[PDB]
Tab-separated table of all heavy atoms in Angstrom:
chain	number	residue	atom	x	y	z
A	1	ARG	N	0.817	-1.214	0.000
A	1	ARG	CA	0.000	0.000	0.000
A	1	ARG	C	0.851	1.265	0.000
A	1	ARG	O	1.312	1.717	-1.052
A	1	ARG	CB	-0.946	-0.015	1.201
A	1	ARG	CG	-1.802	-1.253	1.276
A	1	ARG	CD	-2.839	-1.139	2.362
A	1	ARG	NE	-3.654	-2.341	2.424
A	1	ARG	CZ	-4.748	-2.534	1.698
A	1	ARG	NH1	-5.160	-1.596	0.862
A	1	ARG	NH2	-5.431	-3.661	1.813
A	2	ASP	N	1.032	1.844	1.175
A	2	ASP	CA	1.825	3.053	1.366
A	2	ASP	C	3.314	2.868	1.104
A	2	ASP	O	4.005	3.798	0.712
A	2	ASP	CB	1.626	3.597	2.772
A	2	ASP	CG	1.875	2.557	3.835
A	2	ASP	OD1	1.138	1.554	3.875
A	2	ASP	OD2	2.807	2.745	4.640
A	3	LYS	N	3.793	1.647	1.314
A	3	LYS	CA	5.205	1.284	1.183
A	3	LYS	C	5.654	0.953	-0.220
A	3	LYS	O	6.792	0.597	-0.428
A	3	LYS	CB	5.525	0.105	2.088
A	3	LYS	CG	5.950	0.527	3.471
A	3	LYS	CD	5.595	-0.510	4.514
A	3	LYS	CE	5.633	0.111	5.899
A	3	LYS	NZ	5.277	-0.861	6.961
A	4	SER	N	4.774	1.113	-1.189
A	4	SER	CA	5.057	0.785	-2.566
A	4	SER	C	6.197	1.529	-3.227
A	4	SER	O	6.721	1.036	-4.204
A	4	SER	CB	3.815	0.972	-3.411
A	4	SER	OG	4.150	0.959	-4.782
A	5	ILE	N	6.575	2.696	-2.729
A	5	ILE	CA	7.649	3.437	-3.376
A	5	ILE	C	8.938	2.666	-3.353
A	5	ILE	O	9.643	2.621	-4.338
A	5	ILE	CB	7.889	4.783	-2.715
A	5	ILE	CG1	7.485	4.706	-1.252
A	5	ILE	CG2	7.090	5.854	-3.425
A	5	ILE	CD1	7.693	5.996	-0.493
A	6	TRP	N	9.266	2.066	-2.217
A	6	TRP	CA	10.468	1.248	-2.147
A	6	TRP	C	10.183	-0.228	-2.368
A	6	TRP	O	11.063	-0.972	-2.746
A	6	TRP	CB	11.236	1.461	-0.851
A	6	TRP	CG	10.576	0.954	0.365
A	6	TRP	CD1	9.702	1.624	1.152
A	6	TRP	CD2	10.765	-0.318	0.968
A	6	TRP	NE1	9.320	0.842	2.204
A	6	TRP	CE2	9.965	-0.358	2.112
A	6	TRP	CE3	11.533	-1.429	0.651
A	6	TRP	CZ2	9.905	-1.460	2.929
A	6	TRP	CZ3	11.469	-2.517	1.464
A	6	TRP	CH2	10.661	-2.530	2.587
A	7	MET	N	8.962	-0.646	-2.096
A	7	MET	CA	8.560	-2.020	-2.339
A	7	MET	C	8.464	-2.425	-3.807
A	7	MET	O	8.865	-3.504	-4.173
A	7	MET	CB	7.225	-2.289	-1.687
A	7	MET	CG	6.881	-3.750	-1.607
A	7	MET	SD	7.679	-4.466	-0.184
A	7	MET	CE	7.401	-6.197	-0.496
A	8	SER	N	7.933	-1.559	-4.655
A	8	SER	CA	7.735	-1.920	-6.043
A	8	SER	C	9.014	-2.287	-6.757
A	8	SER	O	9.016	-3.178	-7.583
A	8	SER	CB	6.982	-0.841	-6.806
A	8	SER	OG	7.778	0.303	-7.016
A	9	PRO	N	10.112	-1.601	-6.467
A	9	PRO	CA	11.340	-1.967	-7.159
A	9	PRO	C	11.753	-3.385	-6.854
A	9	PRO	O	12.181	-4.105	-7.735
A	9	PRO	CB	12.355	-1.027	-6.550
A	9	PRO	CG	11.572	0.188	-6.236
A	9	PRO	CD	10.196	-0.273	-5.856
A	10	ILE	N	11.641	-3.799	-5.611
A	10	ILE	CA	12.024	-5.145	-5.298
A	10	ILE	C	11.139	-6.142	-6.021
A	10	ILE	O	11.622	-7.101	-6.581
A	10	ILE	CB	11.963	-5.386	-3.792
A	10	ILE	CG1	12.719	-4.288	-3.063
A	10	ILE	CG2	12.578	-6.721	-3.445
A	10	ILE	CD1	13.223	-4.714	-1.713
A	11	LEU	N	9.847	-5.883	-6.068
A	11	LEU	CA	8.906	-6.818	-6.674
A	11	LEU	C	9.022	-6.829	-8.189
A	11	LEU	O	8.724	-7.841	-8.832
A	11	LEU	CB	7.483	-6.468	-6.259
A	11	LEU	CG	7.167	-6.684	-4.789
A	11	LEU	CD1	5.728	-6.328	-4.524
A	11	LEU	CD2	7.438	-8.118	-4.416
A	12	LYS	N	9.440	-5.712	-8.780
A	12	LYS	CA	9.606	-5.688	-10.225
A	12	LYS	C	10.866	-6.431	-10.640
A	12	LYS	O	10.968	-6.903	-11.777
A	12	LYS	CB	9.637	-4.252	-10.735
A	12	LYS	CG	8.280	-3.586	-10.802
A	12	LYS	CD	8.411	-2.157	-11.273
A	12	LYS	CE	7.076	-1.440	-11.269
A	12	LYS	NZ	6.135	-2.011	-12.263
A	13	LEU	N	11.834	-6.564	-9.731
A	13	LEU	CA	13.055	-7.267	-10.096
A	13	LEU	C	12.969	-8.747	-9.770
A	13	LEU	O	13.722	-9.549	-10.328
A	13	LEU	CB	14.264	-6.632	-9.424
A	13	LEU	CG	15.295	-6.291	-10.494
A	13	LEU	CD1	16.087	-5.078	-10.110
A	13	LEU	CD2	16.218	-7.457	-10.739
A	14	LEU	N	12.061	-9.135	-8.881
A	14	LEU	CA	11.777	-10.554	-8.714
A	14	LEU	C	11.005	-11.085	-9.909
A	14	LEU	O	11.131	-12.260	-10.272
A	14	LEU	CB	11.001	-10.783	-7.426
A	14	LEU	CG	11.818	-10.501	-6.180
A	14	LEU	CD1	10.948	-10.628	-4.957
A	14	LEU	CD2	12.967	-11.467	-6.122
A	15	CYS	N	10.199	-10.228	-10.538
A	15	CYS	CA	9.461	-10.641	-11.722
A	15	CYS	C	10.386	-10.829	-12.911
A	15	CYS	O	10.327	-11.855	-13.596
A	15	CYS	CB	8.391	-9.613	-12.053
A	15	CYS	SG	6.983	-9.689	-10.980
A	16	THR	N	11.263	-9.856	-13.165
A	16	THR	CA	12.125	-9.952	-14.333
A	16	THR	C	13.277	-10.917	-14.101
A	16	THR	O	13.989	-11.271	-15.041
A	16	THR	CB	12.662	-8.580	-14.726
A	16	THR	OG1	13.475	-8.717	-15.891
A	16	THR	CG2	13.511	-8.027	-13.649
A	17	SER	N	13.494	-11.345	-12.859
A	17	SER	CA	14.443	-12.428	-12.639
A	17	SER	C	13.842	-13.753	-13.068
A	17	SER	O	14.553	-14.636	-13.559
A	17	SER	CB	14.867	-12.480	-11.179
A	17	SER	OG	15.366	-11.224	-10.762
A	18	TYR	N	12.530	-13.905	-12.905
A	18	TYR	CA	11.877	-15.121	-13.368
A	18	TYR	C	11.616	-15.058	-14.864
A	18	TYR	O	11.581	-16.089	-15.540
A	18	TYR	CB	10.581	-15.343	-12.592
A	18	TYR	CG	9.802	-16.554	-13.028
A	18	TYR	CD1	10.403	-17.799	-13.117
A	18	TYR	CD2	8.458	-16.455	-13.336
A	18	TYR	CE1	9.686	-18.909	-13.519
A	18	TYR	CE2	7.735	-17.557	-13.735
A	18	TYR	CZ	8.351	-18.776	-13.824
A	18	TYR	OH	7.620	-19.864	-14.221
A	19	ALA	N	11.470	-13.852	-15.407
A	19	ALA	CA	11.104	-13.721	-16.811
A	19	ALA	C	12.288	-13.980	-17.725
A	19	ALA	O	12.112	-14.415	-18.868
A	19	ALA	CB	10.528	-12.339	-17.072
A	20	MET	N	13.502	-13.719	-17.248
A	20	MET	CA	14.673	-13.968	-18.076
A	20	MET	C	15.237	-15.357	-17.820
A	20	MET	O	16.092	-15.834	-18.572
A	20	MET	CB	15.729	-12.898	-17.823
A	20	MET	CG	15.221	-11.491	-18.029
A	20	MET	SD	15.069	-11.012	-19.745
A	20	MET	CE	16.799	-10.906	-20.166
A	21	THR	N	14.761	-16.030	-16.774
A	21	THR	CA	15.301	-17.345	-16.459
A	21	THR	C	14.680	-18.417	-17.338
A	21	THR	O	15.378	-19.320	-17.808
A	21	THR	CB	15.089	-17.655	-14.983
A	21	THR	OG1	15.683	-16.612	-14.211
A	21	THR	CG2	15.743	-18.965	-14.610
A	22	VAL	N	13.373	-18.321	-17.591
A	22	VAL	CA	12.731	-19.251	-18.509
A	22	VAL	C	13.243	-18.987	-19.927
A	22	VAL	O	13.706	-17.887	-20.251
A	22	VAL	CB	11.201	-19.131	-18.393
A	22	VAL	CG1	10.605	-18.208	-19.445
A	22	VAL	CG2	10.560	-20.497	-18.441
A	23	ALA	N	13.227	-20.021	-20.761
A	23	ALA	CA	13.968	-19.973	-22.014
A	23	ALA	C	13.096	-19.732	-23.229
A	23	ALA	O	13.309	-20.373	-24.260
A	23	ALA	CB	14.758	-21.261	-22.216
A	24	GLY	N	12.142	-18.825	-23.147
A	24	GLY	CA	11.352	-18.475	-24.298
A	24	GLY	C	11.498	-17.007	-24.608
A	24	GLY	O	12.529	-16.397	-24.323
A	25	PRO	N	10.480	-16.410	-25.215
A	25	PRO	CA	10.458	-14.958	-25.330
A	25	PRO	C	10.228	-14.345	-23.967
A	25	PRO	O	9.674	-14.972	-23.063
A	25	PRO	CB	9.278	-14.694	-26.263
A	25	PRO	CG	8.381	-15.818	-26.010
A	25	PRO	CD	9.250	-17.011	-25.748
A	26	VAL	N	10.706	-13.117	-23.807
A	26	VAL	CA	10.433	-12.386	-22.584
A	26	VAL	C	8.957	-12.025	-22.566
A	26	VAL	O	8.373	-11.704	-23.607
A	26	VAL	CB	11.324	-11.143	-22.499
A	26	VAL	CG1	11.341	-10.595	-21.093
A	26	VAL	CG2	12.711	-11.482	-22.948
A	27	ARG	N	8.334	-12.120	-21.397
A	27	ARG	CA	6.908	-11.879	-21.278
A	27	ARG	C	6.621	-11.043	-20.044
A	27	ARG	O	7.457	-10.911	-19.149
A	27	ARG	CB	6.131	-13.189	-21.222
A	27	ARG	CG	6.975	-14.375	-20.841
A	27	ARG	CD	6.724	-15.530	-21.776
A	27	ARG	NE	5.722	-16.449	-21.262
A	27	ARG	CZ	6.017	-17.597	-20.667
A	27	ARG	NH1	7.282	-17.955	-20.516
A	27	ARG	NH2	5.053	-18.385	-20.224
A	28	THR	N	5.424	-10.463	-20.024
A	28	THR	CA	4.974	-9.685	-18.881
A	28	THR	C	4.809	-10.586	-17.671
A	28	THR	O	4.059	-11.563	-17.707
A	28	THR	CB	3.648	-9.007	-19.198
A	28	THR	OG1	2.723	-9.990	-19.668
A	28	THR	CG2	3.830	-7.961	-20.267
A	29	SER	N	5.519	-10.259	-16.599
A	29	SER	CA	5.544	-11.070	-15.392
A	29	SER	C	4.810	-10.347	-14.278
A	29	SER	O	5.191	-9.241	-13.897
A	29	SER	CB	6.982	-11.364	-14.980
A	29	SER	OG	7.809	-10.261	-15.285
A	30	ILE	N	3.777	-10.981	-13.743
A	30	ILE	CA	2.902	-10.357	-12.766
A	30	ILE	C	3.123	-11.033	-11.424
A	30	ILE	O	3.232	-12.262	-11.358
A	30	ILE	CB	1.430	-10.468	-13.186
A	30	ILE	CG1	1.284	-10.088	-14.653
A	30	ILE	CG2	0.572	-9.574	-12.342
A	30	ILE	CD1	-0.088	-10.353	-15.212
A	31	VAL	N	3.215	-10.238	-10.361
A	31	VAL	CA	3.118	-10.778	-9.012
A	31	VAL	C	1.689	-11.245	-8.822
A	31	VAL	O	0.778	-10.423	-8.714
A	31	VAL	CB	3.476	-9.741	-7.937
A	31	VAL	CG1	3.288	-10.335	-6.568
A	31	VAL	CG2	4.882	-9.280	-8.093
A	32	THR	N	1.467	-12.557	-8.793
A	32	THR	CA	0.116	-13.046	-8.548
A	32	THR	C	-0.280	-12.845	-7.093
A	32	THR	O	-1.171	-12.046	-6.789
A	32	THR	CB	0.000	-14.514	-8.948
A	32	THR	OG1	1.197	-15.204	-8.588
A	32	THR	CG2	-0.216	-14.631	-10.433
A	33	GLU	N	0.379	-13.539	-6.173
A	33	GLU	CA	0.100	-13.307	-4.767
A	33	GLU	C	1.342	-13.572	-3.943
A	33	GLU	O	2.265	-14.268	-4.369
A	33	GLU	CB	-1.053	-14.171	-4.253
A	33	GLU	CG	-0.734	-15.642	-4.120
A	33	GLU	CD	-1.004	-16.409	-5.392
A	33	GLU	OE1	-1.591	-15.821	-6.322
A	33	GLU	OE2	-0.637	-17.599	-5.462
A	34	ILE	N	1.348	-12.994	-2.750
A	34	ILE	CA	2.408	-13.189	-1.776
A	34	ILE	C	1.833	-14.020	-0.642
A	34	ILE	O	0.722	-13.755	-0.176
A	34	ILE	CB	2.952	-11.846	-1.263
A	34	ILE	CG1	3.419	-10.983	-2.427
A	34	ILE	CG2	4.130	-12.061	-0.371
A	34	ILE	CD1	3.785	-9.580	-2.020
A	35	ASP	N	2.567	-15.047	-0.232
A	35	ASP	CA	2.185	-15.860	0.917
A	35	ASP	C	2.378	-15.032	2.176
A	35	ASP	O	3.503	-14.802	2.621
A	35	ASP	CB	3.008	-17.138	0.954
A	35	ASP	CG	2.531	-18.155	-0.050
A	35	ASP	OD1	1.303	-18.299	-0.206
A	35	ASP	OD2	3.378	-18.804	-0.696
A	36	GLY	N	1.274	-14.568	2.752
A	36	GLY	CA	1.330	-13.502	3.729
A	36	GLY	C	1.241	-12.184	2.994
A	36	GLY	O	1.748	-12.074	1.879
A	37	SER	N	0.608	-11.179	3.585
A	37	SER	CA	0.335	-9.964	2.833
A	37	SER	C	1.607	-9.154	2.616
A	37	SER	O	2.652	-9.408	3.219
A	37	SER	CB	-0.717	-9.126	3.543
A	37	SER	OG	-1.929	-9.848	3.650
A	38	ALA	N	1.513	-8.182	1.708
A	38	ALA	CA	2.701	-7.440	1.303
A	38	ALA	C	3.168	-6.506	2.404
A	38	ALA	O	4.363	-6.220	2.518
A	38	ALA	CB	2.424	-6.663	0.023
A	39	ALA	N	2.245	-6.037	3.242
A	39	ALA	CA	2.655	-5.267	4.409
A	39	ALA	C	3.118	-6.186	5.531
A	39	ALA	O	3.679	-5.726	6.531
A	39	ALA	CB	1.514	-4.365	4.874
A	40	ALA	N	2.887	-7.492	5.386
A	40	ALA	CA	3.497	-8.454	6.293
A	40	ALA	C	4.809	-8.973	5.728
A	40	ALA	O	5.491	-9.783	6.365
A	40	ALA	CB	2.536	-9.610	6.564
A	41	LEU	N	5.168	-8.538	4.520
A	41	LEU	CA	6.500	-8.831	4.003
A	41	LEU	C	7.364	-7.582	3.996
A	41	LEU	O	8.589	-7.670	4.130
A	41	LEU	CB	6.416	-9.430	2.602
A	41	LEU	CG	7.685	-10.129	2.107
A	41	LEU	CD1	7.317	-11.392	1.415
A	41	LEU	CD2	8.498	-9.279	1.158
A	42	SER	N	6.745	-6.411	3.825
A	42	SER	CA	7.495	-5.165	3.919
A	42	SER	C	8.006	-4.951	5.334
A	42	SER	O	9.097	-4.410	5.535
A	42	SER	CB	6.626	-3.993	3.488
A	42	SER	OG	5.677	-3.697	4.490
A	43	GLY	N	7.242	-5.391	6.329
A	43	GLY	CA	7.755	-5.390	7.686
A	43	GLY	C	8.802	-6.465	7.908
A	43	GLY	O	9.672	-6.326	8.769
A	44	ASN	N	8.735	-7.550	7.135
A	44	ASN	CA	9.700	-8.628	7.308
A	44	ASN	C	11.060	-8.244	6.750
A	44	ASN	O	12.092	-8.730	7.223
A	44	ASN	CB	9.197	-9.903	6.642
A	44	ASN	CG	8.285	-10.700	7.538
A	44	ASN	OD1	8.420	-10.675	8.759
A	44	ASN	ND2	7.349	-11.423	6.936
A	45	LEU	N	11.083	-7.380	5.738
A	45	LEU	CA	12.356	-6.937	5.191
A	45	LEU	C	13.004	-5.900	6.094
A	45	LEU	O	14.233	-5.833	6.189
A	45	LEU	CB	12.158	-6.376	3.788
A	45	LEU	CG	11.707	-7.396	2.754
A	45	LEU	CD1	11.362	-6.708	1.465
A	45	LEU	CD2	12.803	-8.405	2.535
A	46	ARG	N	12.192	-5.090	6.774
A	46	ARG	CA	12.747	-4.044	7.625
A	46	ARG	C	13.323	-4.622	8.909
A	46	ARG	O	14.103	-3.960	9.601
A	46	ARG	CB	11.677	-3.003	7.927
A	46	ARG	CG	11.251	-2.225	6.704
A	46	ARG	CD	9.944	-1.488	6.922
A	46	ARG	NE	10.107	-0.279	7.719
A	46	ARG	CZ	9.825	-0.195	9.012
A	46	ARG	NH1	9.364	-1.250	9.664
A	46	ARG	NH2	10.003	0.948	9.655
A	47	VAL	N	12.945	-5.853	9.250
A	47	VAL	CA	13.664	-6.573	10.292
A	47	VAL	C	15.039	-6.975	9.784
A	47	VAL	O	16.046	-6.826	10.485
A	47	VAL	CB	12.845	-7.788	10.759
A	47	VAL	CG1	13.636	-8.625	11.740
A	47	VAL	CG2	11.553	-7.322	11.393
């Protein structure tokens, strides 16, 4: 939510790390869901 300014960069690079690893054309990579909410992971990184 509010933490997206610094959160989005991390999530956009986890997507393109998976998108270049598979061996086809590059494709749009979407964060489907996070196990535990994103504000429960943004707090987990700040620990």
Side-chain angles (χ1 to χ4, degrees):
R1 305 188 180 273
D2 53 297
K3 271 151 198 179
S4 166
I5 28 180
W6 69 271
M7 194 83 191
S8 71
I10 310 205
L11 292 181
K12 283 178 183 294
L13 234 149
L14 292 175
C15 284
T16 181
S17 306
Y18 178 52
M20 305 283 290
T21 304
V22 96
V26 196
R27 19 227 266 260
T28 53
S29 35
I30 314 172
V31 177
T32 39
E33 71 271 352
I34 304 172
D35 283 319
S37 299
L41 196 138
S42 74
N44 275 330
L45 294 172
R46 293 164 77 260
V47 174

